[PDB]
Amino acid sequence: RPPNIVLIFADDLGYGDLGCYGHPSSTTPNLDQLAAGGLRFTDFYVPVSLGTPSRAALLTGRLPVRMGMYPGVLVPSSRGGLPLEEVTVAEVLAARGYLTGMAGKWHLGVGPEGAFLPPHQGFHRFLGIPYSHDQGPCQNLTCFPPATPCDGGCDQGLVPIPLLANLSVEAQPPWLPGLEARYMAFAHDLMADAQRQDRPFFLYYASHHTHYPQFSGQSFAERSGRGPFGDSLMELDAAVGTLMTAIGDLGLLEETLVIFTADNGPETMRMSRGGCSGLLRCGKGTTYEGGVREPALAFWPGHIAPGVTHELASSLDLLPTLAALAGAPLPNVTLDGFDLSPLLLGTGKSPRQSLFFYPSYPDEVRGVFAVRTGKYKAHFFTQGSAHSDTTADPACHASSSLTAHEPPLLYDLSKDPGENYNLLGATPEVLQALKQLQLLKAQLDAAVTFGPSQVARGEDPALQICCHPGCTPRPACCHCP
Amino acid sequence: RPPNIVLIFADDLGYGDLGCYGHPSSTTPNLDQLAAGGLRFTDFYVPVSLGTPSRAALLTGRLPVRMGMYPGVLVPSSRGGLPLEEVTVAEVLAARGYLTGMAGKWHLGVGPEGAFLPPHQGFHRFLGIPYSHDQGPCQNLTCFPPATPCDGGCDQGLVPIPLLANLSVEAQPPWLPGLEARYMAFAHDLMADAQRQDRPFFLYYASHHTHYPQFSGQSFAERSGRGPFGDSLMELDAAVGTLMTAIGDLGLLEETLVIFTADNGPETMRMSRGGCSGLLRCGKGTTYEGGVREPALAFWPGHIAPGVTHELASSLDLLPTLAALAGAPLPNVTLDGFDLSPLLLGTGKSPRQSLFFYPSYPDEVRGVFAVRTGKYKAHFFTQGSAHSDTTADPACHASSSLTAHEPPLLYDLSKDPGENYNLLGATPEVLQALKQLQLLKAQLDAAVTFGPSQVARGEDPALQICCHPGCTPRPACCHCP
Numbered sequence A, B: 001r002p003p004n005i006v007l008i009f010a011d012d013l014g015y016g017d018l019g020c021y022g023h024p025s026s027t028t029p030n031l032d033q034l035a036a037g038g039l040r041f042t043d044f045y046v047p048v049s050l051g052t053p054s055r056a057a058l059l060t061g062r063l064p065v066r067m068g069m070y071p072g073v074l075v076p077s078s079r080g081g082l083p084l085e086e087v088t089v090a091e092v093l094a095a096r097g098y099l100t101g102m103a104g105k106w107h108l109g110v111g112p113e114g115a116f117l118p119p120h121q122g123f124h125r126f127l128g129i130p131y132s133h134d135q136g137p138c139q140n141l142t143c144f145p146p147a148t149p150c151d152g153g154c155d156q157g158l159v160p161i162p163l164l165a166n167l168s169v170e171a172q173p174p175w176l177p178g179l180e181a182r183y184m185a186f187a188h189d190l191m192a193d194a195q196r197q198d199r200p201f202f203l204y205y206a207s208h209h210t211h212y213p214q215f216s217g218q219s220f221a222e223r224s225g226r227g228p229f230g231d232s233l234m235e236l237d238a239a240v241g242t243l244m245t246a247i248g249d250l251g252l253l254e255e256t257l258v259i260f261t262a263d264n265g266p267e268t269m270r271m272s273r274g275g276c277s278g279l280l281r282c283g284k285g286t287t288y289e290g291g292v293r294e295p296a297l298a299f300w301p302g303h304i305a306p307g308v309t310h311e312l313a314s315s316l317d318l319l320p321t322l323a324a325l326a327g328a329p330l331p332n333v334t335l336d337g338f339d340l341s342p343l344l345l346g347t348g349k350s351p352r353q354s355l356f357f358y359p360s361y362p363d364e365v366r367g368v369f370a371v372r373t374g375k376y377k378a379h380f381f382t383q384g385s386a387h388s389d390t391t392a393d394p395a396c397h398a399s400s401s402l403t404a405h406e407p408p409l410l411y412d413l414s415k416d417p418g419e420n421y422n423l424l425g426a427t428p429e430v431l432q433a434l435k436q437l438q439l440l441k442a443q444l445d446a447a448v449t450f451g452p453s454q455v456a457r458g459e460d461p462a463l464q465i466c467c468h469p470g471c472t473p474r475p476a477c478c479h480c481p
């Protein structure tokens, strides 16, 4: 009965990059066709616009500050990770008899002997990199075949990037141009095996596209009309087409729910090798709309009618929506998301009315930075980010320091999705929204306790993964292509 | 044999406003469905981003400086207008036996006894306003029924706005909320009458949406989810649906070519009551992409296959493309556009490789401001505009004075459609494009002679249209609702 679920999650992909979201030069045919036969969201969000906190909110349905996933992101030597008491979507579904698998980027911790890796958090199978593909030296890696080097060199002084098969190093570093093929092969096996055992599968595909540095296989190099950022987006798009064909071939089209979203806004610091937030303001690292609002598509033939919704939805609602769909019971913890099945099935409206946004570096004195309720969004604090540097808007830059706003900056997103015109710079409708927004912020700030910081547990270079354990000299000896 | 042609031309509508171009809250179902069954252009342009010069380029296929359509726009007391020796598309088709008609905004001149009005430039029928609907006092007009006044008051000290039937005042001022119905009725009659006489029709629908001040009939007031700008865009969209139904009802779907575009970018000076250029920079009044690049759709069942093109196209190419399609010979003058039928019919590529952009206020010493060839665009001079004021980008503002750039600012629009990263801030590909761009500008500037300025012929208040001729006191006595 339960449907097969495929969750595709891109990296550093903006609201404005898909062809079907208006980009003028992107090449995204498979995703455009998924949009045309399914539900496209205009108002779907993540609560925090950084890699780690966003992946944690997705898998647990819980605001990242509750389990210490702040500040910033995790690094290869981090001691901390997503606590093992947290229940993930993979576990909710595993206990209901799903065969669960994950391909790609984890970024939720490695820890002493890989205690925080995926196999310990409900995934039966796992093929991927445990953090971002730029958190290790890349001046000698090939990003585009036959021999175009990755640009800029990535993070120095670390072990090369490891490709893992569950808990074992399969390659270090992997060959970037062939990663996609590896991941499609893995996905195909997971599907077929689940079919054979008469059980539903759950595929978590956490792509490295479109994070820096850009790369692709040889079928896409110089073929998109948007340079390296495009080639890489085009490969991600072809991966979606490949998964849809594999779902075709096995006669599972009407029994599989396919969801596509992305973790956080574009890193405009990469300039034309980085994403695009379209009409929205600023990008990764900020609580402006270009940082937190992402593309989101839902496709399930004969169940989800083709259309466009403007209803409020969050990555936080994915656990409870998927549980409900699979007839799995919810964990016994406070959750911050809701079941969106009525909306998906067209029998009801989204139950979500409000959204809460935390910054990259949160603190308990300040609390939530921005809150949206209906079409209104208030900003109590504003701050630019180096990840959103280089565009013409000065509020996006790292030089825009942390600034308090009281009364808050107040925008009507139905008319000013670009956050250009502060309404408080009077009306009874506005005043009532203002008072609601202020009370929602004070209620959440008083009820939420911050879990102890995982990131502040520190770093220990002995925690880096090494293909040749015991090796010397570290870290350059750790390798095995 | 010749197909029936319907040309829909919007006013002050941005690249980012249609639902099918990515807007998150616009309501444009009929246009989205036309896009889904026809050709959508990502790179279609006008040469000058102001009302008058743009309408002149559209109807003649000639750069506006050749016949003196500069500087700025025409006003109700202007003595000048589009010269009668110019040949328009309506004339090209009339001489081939088309029954031609125009509904809406003209803005190409009135003159002594209406010598410059449409009936003198090849249109058989004409129902509309001879200039923009804000060039006359509007503090007492109703913009939205039952009694919501137009915001801000419009231009003062002038005659109220006249609605004309050929050369006669039908109302002054008209009732804004019922204008659409008038225009649809007129369009329906034109179609039917042409059918009855066994002849092809040419409908030129120059909408007032989405120019300030916004207005609509009662079916759309407060129904879009984007306020007044949305309500007005929603009515324009319903007008398109109505014309498509009328084409249905008469069995002419496969014999009619329908084209939709807009004259110039958004007036962001109206803030949330103005348009949106999406990812593009700046708006009306500038030579940045948000000023000159517009939405553009072509629909003709069983002739134009549904798709998306990135090929170069201009409003300048419409005359020669429509002539060719109707088997009508081209006027004997130098034209600046090309026939795009191969592209439309999918048997060839666009013949256009370059585009030339003039500012609102051009001069013969400076010449062309910006030139695009392939994916490269050079800016030799840059300037902001009060029509593009109020956004966060400072280059769009009226305080950004006229600035020369030598060497020019150079952008690769396939990767940086947002014009953020100057390539000259080295490569052999870049250097060759640079030299090409410089030579194209110098060739055009040396070959083009500016026609004598029509706008500089001055104003004469006796040229204002008056419903009660001889009247006193002018101009308030001129009226007849």
Ligand SMILES: *[C@H]1O[C@H](CO)[C@@H](O[C@@H]2O[C@H](CO)[C@@H](O)[C@H](O)[C@H]2NC(C)=O)[C@H](O)[C@H]1NC(C)=O
Pocket (backbone or CB within 6 Å): A099, A124, A125, A126, A127, A165, A166, A186, A189, A193
């Ligand atoms: C690591 O672990 C999983 C299982 O723990 C490995 O896979 C299994 O895959 C083969 C066929 O592909 C089956 O015969 C077994 O029954 C599978 N076990 C389960 C529980 O599914 C796999 O080699 C590794 N993960 C991957 C795909 O890298």
Ligand SMILES: *[C@H]1O[C@H](CO)[C@@H](O[C@@H]2O[C@H](CO)[C@@H](O)[C@H](O)[C@H]2NC(C)=O)[C@H](O)[C@H]1NC(C)=O
Pocket (backbone or CB within 6 Å): B099, B124, B125, B126, B127, B165, B166, B186, B189, B193
């Ligand atoms: C002004 O002029 C046109 C014609 O010059 C008027 O219309 C004609 O319309 C009626 C039916 O609608 C026909 O009987 C005539 O044959 C038409 N003439 C032509 C040349 O088409 C019309 O009333 C006015 N224009 C509009 C529609 O306002």
Ligand SMILES: [Mg+2]
Pocket (backbone or CB within 6 Å): A011, A012, A050, A051, A263, A264
């Ligand atoms: Mg990310």
Ligand SMILES: [Mg+2]
Pocket (backbone or CB within 6 Å): B011, B012, B050, B051, B263, B264
């Ligand atoms: Mg205009």
